[PDB]
Amino acid sequence: MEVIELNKCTSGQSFEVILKPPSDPSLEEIQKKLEAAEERRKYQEAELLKHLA
Amino acid sequence: MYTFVVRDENSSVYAEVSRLLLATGQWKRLRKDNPRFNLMLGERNRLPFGRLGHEPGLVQLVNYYRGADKLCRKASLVKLIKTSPELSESCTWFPESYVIYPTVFLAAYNRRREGREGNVWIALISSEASELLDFIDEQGQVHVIQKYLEKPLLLEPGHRKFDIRSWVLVDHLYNIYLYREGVLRTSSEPYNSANFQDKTCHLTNHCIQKYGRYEEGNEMFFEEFNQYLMDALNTTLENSILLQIKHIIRSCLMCIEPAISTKHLHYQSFQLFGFDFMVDEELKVWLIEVNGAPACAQKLYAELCQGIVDVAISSVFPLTSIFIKLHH
Amino acid sequence: REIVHIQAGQCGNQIGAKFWEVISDEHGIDPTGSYHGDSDLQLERINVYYNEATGNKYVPRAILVDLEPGTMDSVRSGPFGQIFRPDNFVFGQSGAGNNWAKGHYTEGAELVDSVLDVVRKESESCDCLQGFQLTHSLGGGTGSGMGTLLISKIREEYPDRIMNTFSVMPSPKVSDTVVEPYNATLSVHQLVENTDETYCIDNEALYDICFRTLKLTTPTYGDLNHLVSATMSGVTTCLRFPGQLNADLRKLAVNMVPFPRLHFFMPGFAPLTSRGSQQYRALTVPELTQQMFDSKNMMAACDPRHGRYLTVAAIFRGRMSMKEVDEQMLNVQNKNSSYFVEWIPNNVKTAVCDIPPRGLKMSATFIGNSTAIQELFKRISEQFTAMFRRKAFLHWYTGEGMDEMEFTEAESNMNDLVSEYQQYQDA
Amino acid sequence: MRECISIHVGQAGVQIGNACWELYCLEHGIQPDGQMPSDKTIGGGDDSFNTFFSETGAGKHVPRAVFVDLEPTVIDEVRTGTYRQLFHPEQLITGKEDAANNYARGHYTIGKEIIDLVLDRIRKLADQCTGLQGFLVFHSFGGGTGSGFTSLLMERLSVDYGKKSKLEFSIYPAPQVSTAVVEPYNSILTTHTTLEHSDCAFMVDNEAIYDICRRNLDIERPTYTNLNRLISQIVSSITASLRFDGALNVDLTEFQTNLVPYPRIHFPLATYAPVISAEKAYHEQLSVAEITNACFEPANQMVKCDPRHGKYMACCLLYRGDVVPKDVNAAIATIKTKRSIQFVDWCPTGFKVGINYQPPTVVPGGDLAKVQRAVCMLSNTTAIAEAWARLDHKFDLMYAKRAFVHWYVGEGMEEGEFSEAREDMAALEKDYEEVGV
Ligand SMILES: Nc1nc2c(ncn2[C@@H]2O[C@H](COP(=O)(O)OP(=O)(O)OP(=O)(O)O)[C@@H](O)[C@H]2O)c(=O)[nH]1
Ligand SMILES: Nc1ncnc2c1ncn2[C@@H]1O[C@H](COP(=O)(O)OP(=O)(O)CP(=O)(O)O)[C@@H](O)[C@H]1O
Ligand SMILES: Nc1nc2c(ncn2[C@@H]2O[C@H](COP(=O)(O)OP(=O)(O)O)[C@@H](O)[C@H]2O)c(=O)[nH]1
Ligand SMILES: COc1ccc2c(c1)NC(=O)CN2c1nc(Cl)nc2ccc(F)cc12
Ligand SMILES: [Ca+2]
Ligand SMILES: [Mg+2]
Ligand SMILES: [Mg+2]
């Protein structure tokens, strides 16, 4: 069991202890997909308003 | 009323646990996928342990021990014996075993060669290595090889091999319960040394007996066999064999208790095990296989499945004994 | 989050009126609109249902609609009649004669725009309008035919607000005329399409509860409507009062409705009480829980054991242990887990509110989306085709423009609805 | 010094944010008006607490916090609470209509109309920062705002701050305290769309916190304030190294370095002991070894699961109070023998220890008792995948029937995002299972 990097200070201490060794999309693409869902919405809503008509 | 689902339809044993449970009029079987169960009589592979114990207001119990496989798989049982210090690479009740994959065995086989000592082994039984090592690759999966017990204890009349199966039940509290009824699965074929390719005389598998001469179903229960020991050997089953069996069951299950205990867990396990032993000519008991999904012998199904319900199931869900508590 | 209430026709105005009495008493608002209550819990969410008027008075956000001046004059004469904003009385004079066609196509058409105008004035006052709740029956003509015509028009003007109805089902045990199955099948078609949430207040179930369980030999509408005001106060608890939930119509619709057309809820109430006579032992949380799931307490004549619960909301009113509520509710599920679908995990939700309703110390209101409601829609489909296979009484409707075809479609949509409820009873 | 911005989203996010910020103020000696007597660098400093607070020319200490709820009710209680003066109005952003437990409504419909206003009040804070580290994002998996707005926010942050780290504190959905039946839809959806944007996420299954509150606090029916004060204790433990002198986890990049070797598998299990009731008049104070052992009992974990049946890739012990290295190593040595602690073969078996001498702080009149020493283990064990299986089963059950799907499609989303998000999750459970066998 090996302690390895004791750092101390006034607040406390820290250290490691080895027991054993080993053996993104774009702003445009965001606004695109987002605005595709708002079109898919306005379609579905215009069909509703068409059917009401 | 408690509730329970069923997910191993081939379970001869829990087939009966299910039956008796219903007949109490206080248990109800739900659909296999119903999550609102108290008791999971679960499947044998990929049982979904990570889903038990998350149902508010439901105390959940299951009939297997997550991690128990380490004791019930030929290759892992060997790894457990060598690495766990509790068992020790030296335990006197396990035959020499090595795990060889197919793509120090030889070393000890040659220290034996240097003594020209018995050098039979098993998987499948050979005497020359090359004979065996060429078999494991002929299958493709992992195999393990073990000192064959060239000088086994043979019942007379018959000059016949056998193994002992003891049924052991571990409850949610990790009490270890040995069933009083054991069984000897006996070969009807006089063990012949030179011809190691004489299956049925070397392998005491009830199935392999595809018989009935000396005992019904090549099966000798404990009353008969103790009497034979008393008459033929001037001893008793307890003294000559059972002491060592309770030491082995106790030792194996004490070993893996930290890995599988459900003492503070959010669900609970019990499990039934079948332990298989080999008694040699010196009246020494040997552990061969530990079976995690064990079939009982028909005469006892009534008794053992009612004892499961009392000790493992009604202990948790309440509505002389047929077991010996093995004390740790 | 304001709600706009609309009550239409004989039945919708009579139960509509009781609702406002009942909940005006729970929020300490009196027949003048002046608050005289003890707890602040009564006013914290008063705006969901009431508009605050100058002088710090409260005026129900209620639009009162009838093709006839009869009932509506009785409301104005009733105990809380003065609370209602008078501009919100919208009414014709011809009546609708228990005729769906007159409600929907001829007489109602004349009057609907004036209703839509009062709806508009109310909506514009609104800060965040959740949607609408309508009280009507499906068996006459105004509430049935005009009622659904309004619902169609509201959804066109406010396509994205929530539409909630309290729909009284007709029953031969309490029936004005023989065309009620015609009127209700036509309306049920409308309701499947244009509401998010409808509470199926069956007059069959109200009748039996009055006869078998309250032992009322000869039940009036006033007896039935006592049951209806109890359920209505119940289901609206978690919208009018502060609690852990603090619900609104939309969250209610999201969690209760897995499939858009299956939005017909079975209400239930416990303890069943009869007007005037107060019994003096409070119930025990186990009693509320067993009773509220009891078919004898359902307000839709369906056997819950003949279907599966898709979803369930349960509301407990009074001082009691939320531990025992948790325990008693977890226990009826795990006892009768067969009757809840496996494929919507954890489909029973529960809430508690400290204020009990008037007269009782502790009460449980049940809201079930059970596939057993199909039994209701089958009952009415049978009475519908019993006459329609002979085209009986049809002339009352062909005389106002309607075609036989329109009946075949409505009949057909309802049998579809029943098939859909049947699909999930086996899933 | 490098600043850290806290973003609290949804009801669960905001109410937990309150719990934490109040705890921070207690621990740092800041008052409900943001006056810190002990700070002598008035109107400034690059002290360690200054990573979470800015100072004012009038010497007020102000959370580097942004609260955002699609609905005014919860953040309003902040606007009128004991710490109303602490925050600055434009950091408390509220909508009008909430997401109705609808991932798609919070992400697409209502998300699009506020995502710009929010990223602007966020950048207003990034501009008072000399060397921004990144973001701590607090949210529920279950709420529509919690799940859906958060993943839209997470996506833009990756865009406007590609170089800054993002850590998550995520409330995982528990039926007992749950308000909605669609939480498994929202959970999978938001995990899939946030996975590659989050550097490290600490899950807190409300089931686990609730039963710790019943068992170890003798609270009959835990409230959110019970769960949130206990949850901010754990949060404090995990952030102390950013707000205090130390040499372990001093910046948000170390969290990924110390606890996340493979980047997808970035869900470290938290275990916390000891949780001791303030009603217990007589309490025997637990030792270093007793509390380090409690870190390997599942009944203390932030998520119920069985680390014996997985493998570790990392481990931190964060102590607060009367603890010395020697006692820790004796307790580690004693524990190593008795417990089933298996690391992956490409990782060293061993612990990174961190000790802060200031003992845990308890908000006066809470349910937690003062204690001389506490510890919070952070362990990246594959056994947490159990929670993913649970969540993914519940999701397969509803989705096989497509129950509730229409609510989502009806806002923009496509049935496809459902199976796409579920396949990611299926990828995730396979990753875990690879590493842990
Ligand atoms: N631990 C804890 N969990 C909470 C708290 N508040 C809500 N939750 C959990 O969050 C889940 C739902 O997410 P919410 O945050 O409440 O919803 P939201 O973020 O406001 O999004 P909306 O749907 O628009 O309301 C529930 O299952 C709760 O268990 C809290 O204060 N503490
Ligand atoms: N080391 C050894 N020496 C001598 N005989 C041995 C032996 N190991 C096993 N045997 C005998 O040979 C048989 C080998 O088959 P094996 O033990 O694999 O069947 P099995 O035990 O897996 C069937 P079950 O799972 O139903 O108990 C053993 O059952 C025993 O009869
Ligand atoms: N429960 C209840 N049902 C009613 C009441 N009044 C009428 N109904 C039912 O409603 C149907 C008649 O419709 P009605 O509303 O009176 O006609 P409308 O005035 O044109 O809307 C009948 O089947 C009655 O059973 C009432 O006060 N209570
Ligand atoms: C089945 O799953 C849910 C059912 C219902 C609801 C819900 C989830 N979650 C919500 O936010 C709205 N809500 C409720 N709404 C209204 Cl109006 N009354 C209620 C009364 C009791 C109750 F338990 C819930 C509600
Ligand atoms: Ca300073
Ligand atoms: Mg009438
Ligand atoms: Mg909210």
Side-chain angles (χ1 to χ4, degrees), chain A, chain B residues 1-131 133-146 148-198 200-202 204-328, chain C residues 1-120 122-280 282-427, chain D residues 1-162 164-261 263-437:
Chain A
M1 193 164 302
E2 175 177 34
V3 156
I4 109 160
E5 268 189 79
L6 199 33
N7 181 268
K8 319 175 79 218
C9 72
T10 278
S11 253
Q13 336 172 16
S14 94
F15 68 92
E16 188 163 351
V17 53
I18 316 322
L19 284 75
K20 289 131 178 107
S23 306
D24 298 338
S26 141
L27 173 35
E28 144 199 279
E29 317 180 60
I30 289 330
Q31 286 192 130
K32 210 231 270 177
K33 79 114 151 197
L34 250 52
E35 267 164 23
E38 161 149 283
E39 277 334 313
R40 279 194 294 297
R41 266 212 303 301
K42 275 141 95 199
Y43 181 84
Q44 292 157 14
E45 176 190 26
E47 296 298 279
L48 171 69
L49 281 206
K50 209 208 219 294
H51 183 276
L52 293 198
Chain B
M1 263 216 168
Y2 313 114
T3 89
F4 79 91
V5 310
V6 162
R7 306 166 60 99
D8 203 22
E9 293 294 347
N10 303 19
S11 179
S12 358
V13 162
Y14 295 102
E16 255 281 288
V17 165
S18 314
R19 260 177 304 257
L20 323 158
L21 264 182
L22 290 172
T24 317
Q26 320 193 36
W27 276 87
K28 161 161 62 119
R29 208 190 133 158
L30 316 154
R31 192 57 252 141
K32 65 170 26 166
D33 169 335
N34 199 325
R36 313 194 81 90
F37 64 82
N38 295 131
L39 175 75
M40 167 160 311
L41 308 177
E43 59 255 56
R44 264 171 77 165
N45 106 306
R46 212 159 290 269
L47 192 163
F49 287 108
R51 265 145 56 188
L52 309 165
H54 302 270
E55 273 307 335
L58 269 193
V59 166
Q60 291 194 327
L61 172 66
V62 50
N63 73 332
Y64 277 90
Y65 259 97
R66 194 174 188 206
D69 36 284
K70 259 175 204 257
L71 206 86
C72 310
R73 263 65 172 180
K74 322 185 258 161
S76 39
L77 173 72
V78 157
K79 183 167 164 233
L80 180 82
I81 300 298
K82 325 192 133 73
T83 37
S84 311
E86 151 143 10
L87 305 201
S88 172
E89 62 114 349
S90 35
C91 55
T92 89
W93 43 272
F94 199 47
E96 205 139 337
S97 311
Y98 306 83
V99 202
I100 323 289
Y101 291 141
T103 321
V104 198
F105 172 18
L106 311 177
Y109 180 170
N110 284 11
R111 320 232 148 211
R112 284 297 208 75
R113 165 170 300 183
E114 306 208 6
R116 190 159 59 185
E117 300 179 72
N119 247 327
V120 192
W121 302 73
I122 175 55
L124 26 155
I125 313 165
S126 304
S127 302
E128 280 278 341
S130 303
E131 176 51 303
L133 301 69
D134 226 341
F135 188 6
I136 54 183
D137 317 282
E138 289 330 307
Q139 304 295 2
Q141 294 102 310
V142 182
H143 264 317
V144 54
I145 43 162
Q146 218 179 11
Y148 198 79
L149 306 180
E150 301 164 342
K151 205 148 235 292
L153 192 100
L154 319 89
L155 296 72
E156 319 287 355
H159 222 56
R160 344 157 34 201
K161 207 183 227 290
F162 78 78
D163 59 51
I164 323 189
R165 152 145 310 160
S166 305
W167 289 283
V168 167
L169 181 71
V170 194
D171 64 12
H172 64 279
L173 302 183
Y174 219 87
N175 295 317
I176 289 154
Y177 290 101
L178 178 67
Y179 180 37
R180 296 205 153 114
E181 302 319 332
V183 86
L184 275 97
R185 323 185 249 164
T186 88
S187 148
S188 326
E189 317 305 318
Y191 184 94
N192 81 63
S193 156
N195 194 241
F196 49 82
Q197 170 40 74
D198 193 22
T200 283
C201 115
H202 290 331
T204 86
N205 295 55
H206 180 295
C207 359
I208 277 15
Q209 323 269 269
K210 78 303 170 194
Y211 180 95
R213 186 174 170 193
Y214 310 84
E215 328 87 32
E216 165 134 44
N218 293 15
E219 274 184 9
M220 175 171 23
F221 295 147
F222 268 0
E223 159 174 78
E224 160 135 29
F225 176 79
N226 170 79
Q227 192 80 243
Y228 161 77
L229 282 171
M230 268 191 143
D231 296 331
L233 289 198
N234 192 19
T235 204
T236 65
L237 181 46
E238 189 62 55
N239 294 34
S240 48
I241 298 140
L242 230 63
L243 269 199
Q244 313 188 47
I245 286 175
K246 294 170 309 184
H247 174 77
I248 306 161
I249 292 136
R250 211 193 322 285
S251 301
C252 290
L253 294 169
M254 296 343 298
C255 192
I256 50 153
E257 172 159 18
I260 75 170
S261 172
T262 79
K263 205 70 69 151
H264 313 295
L265 251 201
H266 39 286
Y267 74 86
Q268 313 236 62
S269 303
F270 69 95
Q271 185 172 347
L272 175 84
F273 304 84
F275 284 77
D276 298 340
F277 303 94
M278 209 30 84
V279 186
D280 76 10
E281 219 183 16
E282 313 230 272
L283 273 171
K284 157 136 153 171
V285 179
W286 299 82
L287 166 68
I288 315 295
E289 179 210 19
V290 200
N291 175 247
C296 179
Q298 255 70 17
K299 168 173 173 208
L300 315 170
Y301 267 94
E303 196 169 39
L304 173 58
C305 301
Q306 169 63 215
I308 277 149
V309 168
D310 310 343
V311 176
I313 300 193
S314 306
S315 36
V316 192
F317 307 106
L319 301 163
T320 302
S321 181
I322 64 138
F323 298 117
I324 316 140
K325 199 157 137 166
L326 298 188
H327 277 146
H328 40 296
Chain C
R1 294 270 302 185
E2 295 90 348
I3 292 182
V4 179
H5 165 84
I6 297 174
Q7 56 195 57
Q10 188 170 44
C11 171
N13 278 282
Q14 258 140 19
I15 85 194
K18 280 274 315 212
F19 173 79
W20 285 104
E21 282 180 31
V22 173
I23 79 161
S24 286
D25 176 274
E26 314 196 347
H27 296 279
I29 308 330
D30 62 20
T32 152
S34 299
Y35 170 68
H36 288 32
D38 45 319
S39 171
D40 269 350
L41 294 191
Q42 317 191 41
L43 278 149
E44 203 192 290
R45 305 233 277 160
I46 208 50
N47 62 301
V48 169
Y49 275 104
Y50 296 71
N51 265 311
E52 204 171 349
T54 37
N56 274 115
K57 309 287 263 271
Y58 306 90
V59 181
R61 213 172 295 98
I63 306 164
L64 296 108
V65 175
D66 209 351
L67 279 172
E68 229 175 43
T71 297
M72 293 214 332
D73 270 338
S74 312
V75 165
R76 204 146 25 198
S77 293
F80 271 72
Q82 319 305 343
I83 196 144
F84 293 101
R85 160 171 216 277
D87 276 317
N88 289 3
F89 287 71
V90 173
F91 59 93
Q93 287 276 341
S94 290
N98 290 302
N99 189 327
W100 193 85
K102 299 190 183 221
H104 204 75
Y105 290 131
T106 57
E107 313 282 335
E110 304 201 29
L111 180 64
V112 72
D113 283 348
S114 357
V115 177
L116 279 170
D117 289 342
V118 178
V119 154
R120 201 160 309 108
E122 284 287 6
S123 269
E124 291 156 357
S125 154
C126 284
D127 192 77
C128 184
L129 163 77
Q130 314 177 48
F132 312 90
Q133 86 176 22
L134 171 83
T135 65
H136 64 146
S137 56
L138 309 181
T142 301
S144 212
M146 200 191 152
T148 47
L149 175 76
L150 264 162
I151 288 165
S152 216
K153 294 194 138 30
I154 303 267
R155 176 177 194 189
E156 198 178 22
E157 206 166 333
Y158 314 80
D160 72 341
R161 305 300 186 235
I162 291 302
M163 184 45 88
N164 179 69
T165 69
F166 294 74
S167 298
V168 174
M169 293 333 204
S171 187
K173 298 150 140 170
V174 207
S175 103
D176 296 352
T177 56
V178 282
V179 288
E180 290 159 357
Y182 283 158
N183 294 342
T185 304
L186 293 158
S187 292
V188 167
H189 189 341
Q190 303 291 308
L191 296 178
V192 169
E193 302 263 301
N194 288 328
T195 68
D196 306 299
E197 296 137 355
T198 61
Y199 295 102
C200 299
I201 289 103
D202 195 349
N203 263 3
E204 173 126 336
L206 307 186
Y207 183 86
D208 298 333
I209 293 166
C210 270
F211 173 89
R212 300 160 192 190
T213 299
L214 307 195
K215 300 310 181 192
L216 300 171
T217 174
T218 288
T220 68
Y221 282 141
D223 296 313
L224 305 195
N225 289 348
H226 173 67
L227 291 187
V228 166
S229 79
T231 302
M232 279 198 295
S233 155
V235 298
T236 61
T237 295
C238 288
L239 304 160
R240 312 182 269 117
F241 286 114
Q244 202 256 29
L245 240 192
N246 274 45
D248 59 75
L249 298 171
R250 191 171 253 94
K251 262 139 159 192
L252 168 70
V254 172
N255 292 277
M256 286 294 294
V257 189
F259 304 107
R261 303 166 93 219
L262 312 186
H263 56 276
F264 293 90
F265 304 153
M266 304 198 352
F269 188 81
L272 302 164
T273 83
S274 54
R275 340 209 299 271
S277 38
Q278 169 191 132
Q279 279 63 26
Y280 317 101
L283 276 67
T284 64
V285 164
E287 277 157 344
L288 291 179
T289 305
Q290 178 264 117
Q291 295 191 27
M292 95 181 329
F293 278 82
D294 205 347
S295 102
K296 288 159 159 58
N297 290 50
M298 299 310 168
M299 316 274 185
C302 309
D303 186 347
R305 293 179 159 271
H306 303 163
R308 319 233 280 149
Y309 281 110
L310 292 190
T311 62
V312 191
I315 165 64
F316 287 84
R317 288 190 70 173
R319 270 202 253 101
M320 80 222 300
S321 55
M322 309 163 77
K323 189 214 190 101
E324 217 182 354
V325 190
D326 286 359
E327 306 184 6
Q328 275 313 325
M329 285 293 310
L330 273 185
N331 154 281
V332 80
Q333 309 176 47
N334 306 311
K335 301 327 324 160
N336 319 119
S337 87
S338 132
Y339 297 116
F340 299 77
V341 279
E342 36 198 35
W343 39 268
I344 305 177
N346 319 120
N347 59 0
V348 182
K349 256 31 168 144
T350 312
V352 188
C353 167
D354 299 315
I355 294 106
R358 138 152 300 182
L360 290 149
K361 257 196 220 322
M362 272 197 343
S363 55
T365 305
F366 167 85
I367 317 189
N369 197 349
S370 162
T371 73
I373 195 96
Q374 71 166 290
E375 287 184 354
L376 199 165
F377 296 127
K378 278 163 186 219
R379 176 183 89 223
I380 291 174
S381 223
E382 273 157 29
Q383 312 167 351
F384 179 101
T385 75
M387 319 182 273
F388 187 76
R389 71 181 160 181
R390 303 295 279 279
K391 270 132 84 175
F393 300 100
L394 221 52
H395 69 96
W396 291 127
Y397 306 86
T398 56
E400 309 271 323
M402 307 202 33
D403 207 63
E404 277 185 26
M405 214 173 34
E406 186 149 358
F407 282 66
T408 298
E409 293 158 14
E411 175 199 52
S412 216
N413 199 16
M414 205 161 48
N415 293 331
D416 289 350
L417 179 63
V418 164
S419 305
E420 206 185 328
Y421 272 117
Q422 250 292 343
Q423 161 179 30
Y424 301 108
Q425 231 171 267
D426 302 337
Chain D
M1 157 281 264
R2 326 210 63 210
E3 303 84 351
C4 283
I5 301 172
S6 285
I7 305 164
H8 315 280
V9 179
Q11 188 181 290
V14 171
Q15 272 171 5
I16 284 170
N18 266 290
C20 294
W21 281 104
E22 157 203 45
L23 192 51
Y24 297 175
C25 288
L26 282 197
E27 291 176 0
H28 294 279
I30 322 185
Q31 315 199 277
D33 46 51
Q35 280 296 115
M36 202 179 171
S38 41
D39 184 347
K40 320 292 193 174
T41 3
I42 289 195
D46 63 345
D47 295 339
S48 238
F49 74 82
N50 287 140
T51 54
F52 278 54
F53 297 79
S54 51
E55 320 200 24
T56 77
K60 156 193 278 194
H61 295 78
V62 161
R64 291 185 208 280
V66 157
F67 294 56
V68 47
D69 199 2
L70 298 190
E71 155 228 341
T73 325
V74 193
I75 289 190
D76 268 345
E77 297 184 63
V78 193
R79 288 160 167 143
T80 57
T82 72
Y83 291 95
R84 99 210 55 169
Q85 311 150 272
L86 207 73
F87 307 96
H88 159 76
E90 338 180 309
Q91 337 171 304
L92 306 180
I93 309 158
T94 166
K96 229 195 169 42
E97 225 193 57
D98 77 36
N101 317 154
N102 198 342
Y103 174 71
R105 182 176 197 83
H107 186 86
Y108 297 98
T109 315
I110 304 196
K112 190 198 226 92
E113 328 157 359
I114 206 163
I115 181 71
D116 284 344
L117 159 56
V118 158
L119 296 160
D120 189 78
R121 320 284 262 262
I122 276 179
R123 158 101 48 215
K124 268 57 201 315
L125 249 54
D127 281 355
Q128 323 158 6
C129 295
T130 69
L132 182 79
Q133 264 167 77
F135 309 90
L136 290 71
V137 193
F138 298 71
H139 67 98
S140 67
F141 279 2
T145 312
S147 62
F149 182 56
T150 294
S151 75
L152 176 59
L153 180 40
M154 275 320 250
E155 281 199 316
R156 287 287 278 284
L157 290 189
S158 279
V159 150
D160 305 3
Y161 305 77
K164 338 301 158 292
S165 276
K166 299 175 251 44
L167 277 63
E168 271 183 294
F169 294 97
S170 314
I171 302 306
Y172 167 115
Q176 321 227 40
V177 293
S178 192
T179 348
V181 291
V182 286
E183 299 213 28
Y185 282 175
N186 301 348
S187 296
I188 276 66
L189 292 178
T190 199
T191 302
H192 162 52
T193 302
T194 304
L195 203 43
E196 279 163 2
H197 303 255
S198 195
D199 301 303
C200 183
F202 306 101
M203 296 207 271
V204 182
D205 182 347
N206 262 352
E207 182 198 59
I209 303 312
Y210 190 81
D211 271 320
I212 285 149
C213 277
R214 277 165 43 174
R215 272 198 264 105
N216 302 344
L217 296 180
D218 307 310
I219 300 143
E220 240 177 60
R221 206 206 164 296
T223 50
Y224 282 141
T225 82
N226 299 135
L227 309 174
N228 283 340
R229 295 215 236 213
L230 166 62
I231 284 168
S232 34
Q233 291 287 302
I234 286 71
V235 177
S236 203
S237 299
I238 306 171
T239 45
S241 53
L242 300 162
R243 341 191 313 277
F244 287 114
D245 209 20
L248 180 72
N249 296 337
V250 265
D251 75 34
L252 317 166
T253 326
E254 253 177 85
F255 284 94
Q256 327 159 210
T257 277
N258 293 335
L259 300 159
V260 174
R264 271 162 81 73
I265 313 199
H266 60 255
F267 296 94
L269 179 59
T271 317
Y272 188 90
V275 175
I276 291 305
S277 168
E279 289 319 309
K280 267 188 59 191
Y282 175 84
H283 174 59
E284 308 181 326
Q285 291 283 327
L286 279 79
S287 62
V288 167
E290 292 173 297
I291 71 179
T292 310
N293 197 44
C295 291
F296 299 86
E297 220 68 78
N300 303 317
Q301 304 172 357
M302 283 325 122
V303 186
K304 291 182 184 190
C305 57
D306 203 335
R308 300 175 295 184
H309 297 109
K311 300 227 208 90
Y312 296 87
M313 326 153 189
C315 216
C316 295
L317 300 163
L318 314 171
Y319 298 80
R320 291 176 97 159
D322 179 53
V323 160
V324 277
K326 193 200 35 185
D327 300 336
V328 174
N329 298 334
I332 286 184
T334 193
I335 261 150
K336 178 57 214 263
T337 76
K338 317 251 229 190
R339 294 273 188 197
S340 322
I341 290 144
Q342 261 282 313
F343 277 58
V344 299
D345 287 325
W346 89 84
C347 291
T349 305
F351 306 72
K352 297 206 192 197
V353 189
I355 297 180
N356 202 278
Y357 296 140
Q358 193 198 60
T361 312
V362 278
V363 315
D367 312 288
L368 299 197
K370 288 150 235 73
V371 303
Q372 270 132 30
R373 56 202 83 52
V375 61
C376 174
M377 174 147 95
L378 304 176
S379 38
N380 200 328
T381 167
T382 58
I384 207 162
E386 277 173 47
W388 296 133
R390 299 175 37 223
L391 211 58
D392 285 340
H393 195 61
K394 292 186 152 159
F395 170 116
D396 299 341
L397 283 183
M398 320 214 276
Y399 190 80
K401 313 281 181 294
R402 260 151 211 59
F404 299 100
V405 175
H406 68 99
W407 285 111
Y408 294 80
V409 169
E411 301 278 11
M413 180 167 333
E414 326 176 30
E415 237 174 67
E417 186 164 4
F418 271 92
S419 38
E420 170 189 321
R422 183 66 183 84
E423 255 326 300
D424 208 355
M425 301 307 308
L428 195 59
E429 283 190 59
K430 218 183 141 285
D431 298 347
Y432 274 101
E433 186 135 26
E434 255 145 43
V435 187
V437 159

